[PDB]
């Protein structure tokens, strides 16, 4: 989509692996605001918005909190307290055509700066003076959308760049999107330090004869201590035997 008419995609009710985005070597710009580039697989959010637009190489730095610019004022504004990551890479081989590509437009003239996360798609003739335009272009009446005219022979700053903006928002509501931490292979009959979905502990994992209900995950003994657990990957009930200990 165009920069003035950027599309917004809602991402929820799925698992996301952000490690493949960092370890790809195809993105020219990879900077995260508020959070670290790493450790994104241990975070959970209620919803994620995905905004995409095409700009030139010089306007890439304009999408940042606390920064100004044409794009920042009249095309796409980020708040000062924005958290998330911005993805951008060169797209000269896909968005440029011989003789100039006019499919991408940008908003240039506006009375006031945009409020953060605003999408303006108005095609009203901009009134540059005290004389009304009445839908007729001319003196003091300029069309708000202009053509980029991308060409394959254009310089680095003039080459088209595809920019994807990731928005991270949280709320008291349950997190619908979460990241998958690596799960090592299960080991049996050894004193190991284990961790599961809700609890951590140290013990010996042995096969059980218990019959958990299909929805149950954890087991408890009489005096409020854990004795059995269900593996989150394999439907096997594993007893937690405490490791051998005693006084000397």
């Amino acid at each position, epitope marked *: 989509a165009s920069v003035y008419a950027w599309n917004r995609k809602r991402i929820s009710n799925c698992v996301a692996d952000y490690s493949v985005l960092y370890n790809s070597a195809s993105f020219s710009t990879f900077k995260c605001y508020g959070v670290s580039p790493t450790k994104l697989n241990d975070l959970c959010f209620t919803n994620v918005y995905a905004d995409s637009f095409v700009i030139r190489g010089d306007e890439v730095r304009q999408i940042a909190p606390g920064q100004t610019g*044409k794009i920042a004022d*009249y095309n796409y504004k980020l708040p000062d307290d924005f958290t998330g990551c911005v993805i951008a890479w060169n797209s000269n081989n896909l968005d440029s055509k011989v003789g100039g590509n006019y499919n991408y437009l940008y908003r240039l003239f506006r009375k006031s700066n945009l409020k953060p996360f605003e999408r303006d798609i108005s095609t009203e003739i*901009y009134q*540059a*003076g*005290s004389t009304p335009c009445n839908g007729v272009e001319g003196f003091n009446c*300029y069309f708000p959308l202009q053509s*980029y005219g991308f060409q394959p022979t254009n310089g680095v*700053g*003039y080459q088209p760049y595809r920019v994807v903006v990731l928005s991270f928002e949280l709320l008291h509501a349950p997190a619908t999107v979460c990241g998958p931490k690596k799960s090592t292979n299960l080991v049996k009959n050894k004193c190991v330090n284990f961790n599961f979905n809700g609890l951590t502990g140290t013990g010996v994992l042995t096969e059980s004869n218990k019959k958990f209900l299909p929805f149950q995950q954890f087991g408890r003994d009489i005096a409020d201590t854990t004795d059995a657990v269900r593996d989150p990957q394999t439907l096997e009930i594993l007893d937690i035997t405490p490791c051998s200990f005693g006084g000397v």
Partner: antibody
Framework: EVQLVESGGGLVQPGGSLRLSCAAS????????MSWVRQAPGKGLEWVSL???????YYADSVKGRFTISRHNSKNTLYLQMNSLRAEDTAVYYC????????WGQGTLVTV | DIQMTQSPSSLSASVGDRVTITCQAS??????LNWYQQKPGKAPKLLIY???NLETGVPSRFSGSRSGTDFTFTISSLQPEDIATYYCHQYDNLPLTFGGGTKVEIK
């Protein structure tokens, strides 16, 4: 109908300050891109600064920390405040419109 | 800063002669270039905007023809009242760049 008039030029010692004015008629200053462009004698034309319609301000690399642009709403006059003038800043300053048409004042003389 | 140099520095031509100058850019600009005419003692005047369109009030004898990265100005008929300094200024890049100037005289 449409005409840009400039005033405020004069002889200023180095290290001093000055303020220029650019009154407009026939159009709205705040809804259009304004710029201050100077021209030193004996050489070519040189851009200095621009201001956006929303209030964003930028300046040339030679005038970081020294030049200031502003605008008074009621009388529709564009101003350029400069501080700590140098010998190379002696130029004939103009106020113009960035896009859709080019409108030029009569010019004023600033000598340092 | 963008590198931009005009060529040639100065030339002389008679009335009605064919005058052709070129504007050289190190970085490729798609169509963002304007031409200006600075009379002696007077401000420059815009003639061609976006390097392909005629400004209202400008005579048709002035035209801009894109030649890849460089852009060339076209004068069909030179007149003694056309003595001015020629500038090409690239736009959409900060700092905005105005060239050294090209002087055309009447011989």
């Amino acid at each position: 109908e449409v005409q840009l008039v400039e005033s405020g030029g004069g002889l200023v010692q180095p290290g001093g300050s000055l303020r220029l004015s650019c009154a407009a008629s026939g159009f709205t200053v705040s809804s259009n891109y304004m710029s201050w462009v100077r021209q030193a004698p004996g050489k070519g034309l040189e851009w200095v600064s621009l201001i956006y319609s929303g209030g964003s301000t930028y300046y040339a690399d030679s005038v970081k920390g020294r030049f200031t642009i502003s605008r008074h709403n009621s009388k529709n006059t564009l101003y350029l405040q400069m501080n700590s003038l140098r010998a190379e800043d002696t130029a004939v300053y103009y106020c113009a419109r960035i896009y859709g048409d080019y409108a030029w004042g009569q010019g004023t003389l600033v000598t340092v | 800063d963008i590198q931009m140099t005009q060529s040639p520095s100065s030339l002389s031509a008679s009335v009605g002669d064919r005058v052709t100058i070129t504007c050289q850019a190190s970085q490729d600009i798609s169509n963002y270039l304007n031409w200006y005419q600075q009379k002696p003692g007077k401000a420059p005047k815009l003639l061609i905007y976006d390097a392909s369109n005629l400004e209202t009030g400008v005579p048709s004898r002035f035209s801009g023809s894109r030649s890849g990265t460089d852009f060339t100005f076209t004068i069909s008929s030179l007149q003694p009242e056309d003595i001015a300094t020629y500038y090409c200024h690239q736009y959409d890049n900060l700092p905005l760049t105005f060239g050294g100037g090209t002087k055309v005289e009447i011989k």
